Amino acid sequence: AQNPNCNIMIFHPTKEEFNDFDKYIAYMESQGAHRAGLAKIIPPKEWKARETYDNISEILIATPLQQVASGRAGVFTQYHKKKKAMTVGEYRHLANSKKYQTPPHQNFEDLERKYWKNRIYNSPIYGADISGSLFDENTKQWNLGHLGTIQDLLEKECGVVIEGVNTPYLYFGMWKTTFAWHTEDMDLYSINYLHLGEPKTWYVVPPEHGQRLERLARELFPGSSRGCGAFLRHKVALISPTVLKENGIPFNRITQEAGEFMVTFPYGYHAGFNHGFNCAEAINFATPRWIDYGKMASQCSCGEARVTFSMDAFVRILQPERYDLWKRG
């Protein structure tokens, strides 16, 4: 079997290989990439997402979220406090201010150490989950607004014809902005392009070991676990690499830089943080291999994890038994 140690693999497709998106995902999996839960794809040198980023400052962040931590440095939750709307230009200025700017650091490992030491003592502001795209409509390869839809995938695989749309999200980040441990909705794939700015560090647990992370999370967040049997769905719990290592949890880490794609694979738990001001775009997608993961995906029914209108049909068709109870939440 390929990639038995579940290492994060990095791919360098040629411009010809970059034409057929589905085919390249299948290729990566043939090499065992999915075993890690996460892969990096560096686009060919001939490719670009758009011409420039000089004109993005007027995009609105309608509901920036302040990420307020509780707990200890290595085991904490974050709750999201709504702030007043800002433009991207205003947000960038805020990110670069003394209060929020990345501290001096020697390299990525030094900054990673500073993040886990000091994250809880600050409350950075994240402009997450903004419907939109920054790919030029003329970019034909790996344009995250022009992928095949999950609804069409389900139809092709299962004959299933369903309502729903699937469009990309933009994210504007700053130092210490954090994505909590999660898998995607319905354990879908995701793809993330870092358009501009400072890096993003990722942590990931191999899909074959996801239940080990879940068990540790239940132990570390016992009240949350009693409240919901899928509380990681809430996307608020953080566990540091030190604590994961202490508890024998298999994981890997990698830093994504501007101009690079990351793909997360079905049931690949991931978490991480932004190094400084940046802009990313992401969307969920499916392949034939996803279908069995979708059938088995845990669900939050406590009501906290509120989700997109597209998810109804996925639960309805793939998980009819669970549908009524899920719909209640």
Ligand X SMILES: CCOC(=O)Cc1nn[nH]n1
Interface with Na ion (CB under 5 A): 252
Is residue 234 marked as binding?
yes
State the distance between the two ends of the chain, measured CA to CA, in whole angstroms.
40
Has 6 been labeled as part of a binding site?
no
| 270 appears as a binding residue in the annotation | yes
Interface map 103-142 toward Cl ion (x if CB under 5 A): x----------x---x------------------------
Q: Residue 188 binds which entry of ligand X, Zn ion, Cl ion, none, with Cβ cut-offs from 5 to 8 Å by kind?
A: none
Q: Which is nearer to Cl ion, 103 or 222 (CB)?
A: 103
Total count of residues recorded for the chain: 329
Residue 57's binding partner among Zn ion, Cl ion, ligand X, none (Cβ under 5 to 8 angstroms by kind) is none
Burial of residue 285 (number of CB atoms within 10 Å: 0-12, 13-18, 19+): buried
By beta-carbon proximity to Na ion, the closer residue of 38 and 228 is 38
Does the annotation place 166 within a ligand binding site?
A: no
Question: Within 10 A of 223 (CB to CB), how many other CB atoms are there?
Answer: 7
Strands (DSSP E) found in the chain:
9-11, 38-41, 60-61, 65-72, 75-82, 86-87, 125-131, 169-173, 178-182, 189-197, 200-205, 237-239, 252-256, 261-264, 269-274, 278-285
In the bound complex, what is the minimum distance in angstroms from residue 182's beta carbon to Zn ion?
12
Distance CA 38, CA 250 (A): 13
Cβ atoms of residues 276 and 176 within 8 Å: no
291 or 307: whose CB is closer to ligand X?
307
Chain residues that interact with Zn ion, rule: CB under 5 A: 228, 300, 302, 304
In whole angstroms, how close is the CB of 265 to Cl ion at the nearest point? 31
CB-nearer residue toward Zn ion: 68 or 302: 302
| Binding region for Cl ion (CB under 5 A) | 103, 114, 118
